[PDB]
Amino acid sequence: HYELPWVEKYRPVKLNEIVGNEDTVSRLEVFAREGNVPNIIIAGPPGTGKTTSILCLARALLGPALKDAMLELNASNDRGIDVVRNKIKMFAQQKVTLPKGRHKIIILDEADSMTDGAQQALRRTMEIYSKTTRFALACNASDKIIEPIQSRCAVLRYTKLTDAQILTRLMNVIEKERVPYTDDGLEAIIFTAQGDMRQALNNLQSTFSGFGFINSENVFKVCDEPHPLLVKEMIQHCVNANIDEAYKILAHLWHLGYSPEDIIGNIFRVCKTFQMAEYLKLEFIKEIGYTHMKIAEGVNSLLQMAGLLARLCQKTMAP
Amino acid sequence: SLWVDKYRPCSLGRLDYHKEQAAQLRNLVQCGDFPHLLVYGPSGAGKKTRIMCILRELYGVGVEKLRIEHQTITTPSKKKIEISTIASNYHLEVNPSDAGNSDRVVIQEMLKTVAQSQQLETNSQRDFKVVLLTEVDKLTKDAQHALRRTMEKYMSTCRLILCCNSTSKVIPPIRSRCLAVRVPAPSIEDICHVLSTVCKKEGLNLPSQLAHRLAEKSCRNLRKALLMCEACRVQQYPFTADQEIPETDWEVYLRETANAIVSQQTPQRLLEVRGRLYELLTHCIPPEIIMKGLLSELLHNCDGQLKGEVAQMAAYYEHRLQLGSKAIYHLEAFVAKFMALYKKFMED
Amino acid sequence: AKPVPWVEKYRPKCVDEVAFQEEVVAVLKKSLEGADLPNLLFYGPPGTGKTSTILAAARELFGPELFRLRVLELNASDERGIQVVREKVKNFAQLTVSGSRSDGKPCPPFKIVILDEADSMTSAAQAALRRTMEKESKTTRFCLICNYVSRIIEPLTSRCSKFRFKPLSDKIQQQRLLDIAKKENVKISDEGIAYLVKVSEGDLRKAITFLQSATRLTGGKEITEKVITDIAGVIPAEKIDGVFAACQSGSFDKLEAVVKDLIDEGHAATQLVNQLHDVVVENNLSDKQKSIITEKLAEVDKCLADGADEHLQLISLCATVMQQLSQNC
Amino acid sequence: MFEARLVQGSILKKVLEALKDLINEACWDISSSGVNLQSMDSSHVSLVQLTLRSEGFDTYRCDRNLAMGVNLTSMSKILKCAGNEDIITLRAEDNADTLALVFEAPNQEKVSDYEMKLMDLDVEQLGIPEQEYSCVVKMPSGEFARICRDLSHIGDAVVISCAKDGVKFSASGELGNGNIKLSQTSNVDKEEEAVTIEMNEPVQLTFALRYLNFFTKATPLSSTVTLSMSADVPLVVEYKIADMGHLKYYLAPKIEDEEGS
Amino acid sequence: MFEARLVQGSILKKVLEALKDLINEACWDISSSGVNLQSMDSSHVSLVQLTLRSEGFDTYRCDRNLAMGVNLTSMSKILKCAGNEDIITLRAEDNADTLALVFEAPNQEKVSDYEMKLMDLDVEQLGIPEQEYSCVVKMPSGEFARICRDLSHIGDAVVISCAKDGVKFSASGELGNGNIKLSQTSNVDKEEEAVTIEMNEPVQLTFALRYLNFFTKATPLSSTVTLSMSADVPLVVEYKIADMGHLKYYLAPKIEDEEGS
Amino acid sequence: KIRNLPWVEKYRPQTLNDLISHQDILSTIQKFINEDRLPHLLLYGPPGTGKTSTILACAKQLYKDKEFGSMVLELNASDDRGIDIIRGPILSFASTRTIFKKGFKLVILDEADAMTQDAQNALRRVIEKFTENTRFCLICNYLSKIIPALQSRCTRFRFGPLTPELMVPRLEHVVEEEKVDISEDGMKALVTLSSGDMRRALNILQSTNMAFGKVTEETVYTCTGHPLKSDIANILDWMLNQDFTTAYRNITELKTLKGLALHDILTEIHLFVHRVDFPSSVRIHLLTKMADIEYRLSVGTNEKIQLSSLIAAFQVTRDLIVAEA
DNA sequence: GCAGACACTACGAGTACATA
DNA sequence: TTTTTTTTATGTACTCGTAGTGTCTGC
């Protein structure tokens, strides 16, 4: 036997062990206790626990009838126009005896990869056989799922995890794993995770396996500080036409080994949600796209990024 | 047959202008080891006449017996595209710009089949064939980058005579591989001599003043000058000194479009000018000639401290037009910038 | 006994015939001796000798009987997609090195893949080449030829030992052109060969083409400087002085007139940009005026590099230098 | 006025899918001796001769010598609706510009007529010289269908030589050459398998692969295939369609490329 | 020098049509004892071992040992054009890359030399454990191929169980369960049809159906296939050719997880 | 035995101890291997830092030579890696057991940035469902080309650029095993021109050993063609001190004599501008101008005109700097 | 034994889209 | 309170129609 990593070994098996989104998880716990759950779409950031919530709800609702009354489909399966017509539909008509308030659950994980025609063919088999079967969909970008499917469900939306919600499960994993720690190292783990519980467990396991103790510099020796938190400060330095500090942060990110594509992509994501004027943001985005054209055609050096920073500083001083 | 085709010279010694260049081209192709040629100059100068005179000098008189040949080429997207081709018993002429952006496929498949095949008759036909690539300035950069190894590997068997208007659109990999032959436009006196010789060969009398006005109105284009000379013969046989010369409709339409630009500077006038530019673009007029005619007419109504900024604006928006794909955006941007500059100049 | 033009007749057959590219020629010469030949990347201006060096090298290493079985040459003239790299290049790189030379000359234990004009390869097709060179380098070698190294991705740049082909110096080009003229029974004056090596600007193919064309034009007599000037498309100095007189006049009508004169006489705008820049960097203008005139010359040359119209770029550059000359008036 | 009747419907179901991908038109020339079809491609590489005599038709009425042209795109969709062992009758009037094609059952009350527009094409007869070749050999039809499909997996151009030992089929490519020499199979029960050589001058020539593979789907039309070729005369492939006539094919040699370093 | 010679060409045809959709390239290991072939599939799940004895060849000579990497997609297009009552010649020089596949046509006249190009894929030698199997079952290849086809209709992966009574095939599929249990059917006139059990320990393993039906394409090679199975070491589908050698197959079991409940 | 291989492949770190720079990451990876708890890895960084060699050393340490074909399914950008491969061979490799010896398998996906988004989306549940039986290693250069679900599933180790302090002894080992005469300035030139990349350092060393036979600063800067620091300082001194024609003549004479290229001159001048205490407006103008010149050199342009513009970009700001005072 | 009918997979063809 | 159409140049994925072809039934 091989020991599992802490991401999959410490997966919650009950709905009370899932932290974050307390109202939605509590309502899912009530549904799992009583029954008659509706069709459900859970959307959110990766690592929030949508697959965990769906699987825990299905395991608590079905129980011993799991192997015959649950159909799990993933992106590793086909889920084409033929699988919806001959596999989802045949399982929907299929007779499975169940207790009262319990239905067959068709789990369609990662429904963004589902094609538009397959989701169109999924509608009438969802509406007709709702007396016998139920659907549970999980997705990251809810815009890829078509509107008639979203109208057929209660579209639940998951938010990014609060640091205390990660911290409680970090206490849980630490006391079942007997991990020596300090407080600042766990704040470093939370800071490296950035709302991702998978990244929190991965970084905690890496720091425990590599060093055996959780302080700040043991975490930052193998993990990394998040990239757009420095890009926000460098864009802020570009806002006040301060080219020296902006180039200092750009050169620090360049000597860390980041490619120009990743740097300019995080620049664009920071400038998307930055707090400035609307016209200044628009000409900043136009300048970023003009530089990204030169990055894409082949020329990508520190000189191009410094020229982009200087043009962004020029956009402030040119009303 | 019109006057542009009935009185075209056949041999290099019959050319009335650029006779020293005709003797140089006579001495160039005599041995047969001449390199690839890049015949460039203004349109209507006589580049194709010199190329066919070179082809007459190399082979027999069989280069004037042409035929239309059709070839269907398969794209990488598996869509069949038909391309027309002028071919003779000694040479062949290709216009790859008729295929659009698929000219790279024409260079990669059509040209290699011609270049990789040695000529069937070696005694009547010479030791090499000639491929005429006409309008290589309109070629995309991918087709020009696919061209270069064909001009190096099978050069001693397949020779090339490239014809274009501007050598700035030709990449320096191609420009290094071929000897550039410059054919300037004939002056007013050479065009007057050609028109007088054509009119005397038809039994007519042509005054010097009318021939001079035909030469200035054609802007040193011998094809256009011979066409308006034939048109002036058609409309009125007595060749008066002040006989009205007919004009093409797109040029005067461009003049009226620029007059409408000057007359009002408002967004709805900009919309009407955009409709006029749509009318000009839908008649297959190239957008750089629209920009050139616009700058030719709008600078007549500008004052002396405004012409440089309008010229720089026109060149900048023409370069952005050649970088982009949609002509109407850059044309309307140039027109809107000119209206803004004209309103700022007149209101101050 | 057919005639052959001089660019292919004087194409280097061996490595010692390549001129002025001393470091890479020494590298391939030690590879000819038997040293570990690395993956090569050749880049530089046109006419410098990137294709001929590797072709003469492969002819030297393999001979006539092993060129077809050890060299795969791919250019932009054939199809190089993701599938050609994934199938044809990988199946060639996975082949066995079998067959030795019959003349007793040593045979190298690798194949050579020549990807000439690798700027035209896509970024996806270049990404499929990486572990082909990393895995199959025991039995094959890769030589990418390009003109701009920015079009080559950074993994492929890092995998290949880069050799930059410099533009040829005046001295080496002068001796090579004099040797070619001596071998062809033709004569050229000192001013003629000086103007030839000034016009060619390190392009040996252009120099050989101009020398051959002047030989055919004159017929075998003295190749003087005037046949070089009228064979190169060099604008006469009177046109440049007329352009500067129209610029110093301060009126746009004479400026349009001389720009229309230069356009109608078939002069290329690259030659006008070169001669105009040569005049501006060698006169008594101020440093600020020279600075923004040269900046306009650079941006006009760039705008001509993407194939913009000649007349509008020339009228914009002439308007800018007209404003610069008439500002101090 | 032209009206003809066929003995079997499978003749047009075996002759007309063969020229699905060769020629862009079907020009039938009416004479008193029979019908004639001489057409070329758009690439001017293959020539097809189809001559069916009048003695084998069920009926044949002819008064004038005309020339009609039939397209392929509408014709190919019609024949899939037609039968196999039925009779196919045709009708064309003197002044009408619409050829009538009927593929009715041999015992039926009603007919089925899918007419098409006559294309007014202006073509001329190039004229085959019918000169003496260098080699004339006889080959089986079904075996020729296999050996044309054989070399399609090797390269794109094949080489056919024909010496006194036999006819040599070669296909050189990046994979490996393949050599096939049919010879001396007269000791068989069937008269179909008798491979004979009639003449003697050997000629080596290269022919394109695709046009031979476009030919060998019409192999159950005839029993044997006669192969005729010379040094500069194009390769002639002869078919004999039962008792009603004969079919002739023509391939110009494929252009061989240069050899370099 | 390597010169092997197949006594009938039908033996090579049935071998390489079983590895056509399964194995990636043919890596022939050549020695004086015979021709070996030990290569995994593309998915690194199945393993094929093929050993042909030198005594089964017509003439076999091998001066020095060779490793012979040959692409099979280009190789499998040559056994399509090969006879079954015919002679197959295999040639390989000491330091060359050509592989002469010389045979005769079904018309049985002509030599047909086809060439391959050798590959330089180095491969680490995979060690066959040669351990004792806790379930050895003799079973006909026709019956093993039939119930593998019937089980592909019902499910995706099949549960194969062996015990004292006999082998048992279970397919938990979409439409339901398909259970086939066969035993002691040696009381027939034929000697090929026989189910025999040799060892004792009862195992249970799940295998992919797409490889079990791939392995049963060697049905014309052997009348009876030996099935070897145990708990740790994988399933073996063993074909023993009568006068040529043996064909040895391996297939790893699938990962299954019991429900927590 | 002697072999005919490039020095970037002849000298490959077959073990984890032969890699030089990322000591903490490799110590954590060795502790993952020794404790039999290796997770799904995401090795990303600039090229030439040793990401392929790290996972090849890991696969060589985990599995012996008699069972390497049964445990490692290595797929890179040279192979077709579509969604048919993820739903086919990769899924069948992940969901099955081992033929010879019981153990966990490894799927190495080199150049995972070149994979499509459909294959990356199909890869998520293959990683998550069969994490006990097999582990997936994704190696990329651009982390933005990998979907955030795959970044969440795999713990990431940033293989940053190789610092020249720890990059020296590996080059010393290559020099000692290759019998190469090298000076101190030659090694300094190698670790300066390499810029955190041990592949091009070995390529420069092999090319300089073949071209000259010795590795000195002059030989390295001649074989590479890079300008020396003193010549870049002289070019900056000419552009900031003298008039247009004299500085143009000096820089053109230096470029003709040394055979320099304008790209390396632009790179080193851009590096020397941030060290020189410029005003903010002057630095912004200079950065924009050199960005324009370095963009302009990517097409068929004349290099002399761009050199004149490079001089012009400093002759503009000379008067501004002096009048700033 | 050979002609007709059945489902089977391989292949050709058309279409959409690729970002946060 | 207002709706047509094929261009962008590859790479990949999806979906559907069609065509050899192995195999089964029957007189």
Ligand SMILES: Nc1ncnc2c1ncn2[C@@H]1O[C@H](COP(=O)(O)OP(=O)(O)OP(O)(O)=S)[C@@H](O)[C@H]1O
């Ligand atoms: N809310 C949570 N509470 C506790 N553990 C969690 C939570 N979310 C994630 N985890 C842990 O992270 C692992 C992976 O969570 P997942 O449910 O797979 O993430 P996800 O929400 O499905 O995101 P995607 O879209 O599938 S990448 C689980 O096995 C848990 O160990």
Ligand SMILES: Nc1ncnc2c1ncn2[C@@H]1O[C@H](COP(=O)(O)OP(=O)(O)OP(O)(O)=S)[C@@H](O)[C@H]1O
């Ligand atoms: N270094 C050189 N030594 C001798 N002859 C040369 C040299 N460079 C160029 N030539 C001559 O010029 C011809 C063209 O040289 P090429 O090697 O094709 O130039 P190039 O490097 O390929 O330029 P590009 O990038 O392909 S446009 C050769 O056939 C020679 O005749």
Ligand SMILES: Nc1ncnc2c1ncn2[C@@H]1O[C@H](COP(=O)(O)OP(=O)(O)OP(O)(O)=S)[C@@H](O)[C@H]1O
């Ligand atoms: N850390 C290192 N220690 C020692 N040698 C190294 C190191 N990194 C790279 N090298 C050398 O450089 C060669 C190439 O290293 P690679 O592992 O292929 O680089 P890489 O990390 O794969 O970069 P990319 O993104 O794949 S191009 C190796 O064979 C070594 O010779």
Ligand SMILES: Nc1ncnc2c1ncn2[C@@H]1O[C@H](COP(=O)(O)OP(=O)(O)O)[C@@H](O)[C@H]1O
């Ligand atoms: N030397 C000449 N003598 C008389 N007519 C000429 C001469 N050169 C050109 N022409 C006429 O002028 C026109 C120029 O067109 P063309 O020769 O195609 O050159 P271009 O390709 O530059 O338009 C032709 O129609 C031709 O009849």
Ligand SMILES: [Mg+2]
């Ligand atoms: Mg999930």
Ligand SMILES: [Mg+2]
């Ligand atoms: Mg080249």
Ligand SMILES: [Mg+2]
């Ligand atoms: Mg790597």
